[PDB]
Write a protein that binds this ligand. Structure first.
Ligand SMILES: [K+]
Length: 234
């Protein structure tokens, strides 16, 4: 089975990760003459890392999600990606987040025994603050464009999935409080949060404080209370 091959790729890539994580130490203890070389090496190893996750073979204009998905179904794989994220450019990191969203229900299924998906919440949250509104909207659009739509049961019932959804909504709120397209996905989201039975909802890792303010824009008082109770909102 390839799962053996995947574990190999994980070990290969994880080794690069430890090197890049050790970089500041080496640079700090280096002679000036060595620094140019240290910097080039760092660059190529970060490229290599991204390529092992999201590289594409000849004849394809977009990478296959295969390799990324395979890695993300493995305990150490998810923890590795969490630690690679901070080293990637914003554009590379957003790709990883969009790919995660596109494949989220399957990744959730494959995380049922390990439950390590939450290790990605922190780096994704840091990333979200660096992303514009078009991006925030596109990610939410992808989450609502999965099998079962417009029902998001698998996501809402998952600690990481719910938390991630709440972080996205929160950041979207920020950006709008600075268009209508954002308003459309917001309506869908509140509808879905309103539908899901409270007993089914996962316990969110964190609850953004601006959520109440966000929901007020699209929903009346009676329903607002529902959400607040449902999500133990602040
Ligand atoms: K792989």
């Amino acid at each position: 089975d390839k799962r053996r091959k995947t574990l190999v790729i994980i070990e290969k890539t994880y080794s690069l990760l430890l090197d890049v994580e050790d970089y500041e130490r080496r640079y700090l203890l280096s002679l000036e003459e060595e620094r140019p070389a240290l910097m080039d090496d760092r660059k190529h190893k970060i490229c290599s890392m991204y390529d092992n996750l999201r590289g594409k073979l000849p004849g394809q204009e977009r990478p296959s999600d295969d390799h990324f998905v395979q890695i993300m179904c493995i305990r150490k794989g998810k923890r590795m990606v969490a630690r690679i994220l901070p080293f990637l450019s914003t554009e590379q990191a957003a790709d990883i987040l969009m790919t995660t969203a596109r494949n989220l229900p399957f990744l959730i299924k494959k995380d049922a025994q390990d439950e390590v998906l939450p290790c990605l919440l922190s780096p994704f949250s840091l990333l979200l603050y660096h992303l514009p509104s078009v991006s925030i909207t596109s990610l939410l659009r992808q989450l609502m464009n999965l099998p079962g739509s417009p029902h998001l049961t698998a996501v809402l019932q998952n600690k990481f999935g719910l938390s991630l959804l709440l972080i996205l909504l929160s950041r979207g709120e920020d950006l709008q409080s600075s268009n209508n397209q954002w308003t459309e996905v917001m309506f869908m989201a509140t509808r879905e949060l309103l539908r899901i039975p409270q007993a089914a909802l996962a316990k969110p890792i964190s609850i953004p404080t601006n959520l109440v303010s966000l929901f007020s824009r699209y929903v009346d008082r009676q329903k607002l209370n529902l959400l607040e109770t449902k999500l133990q909102l602040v």
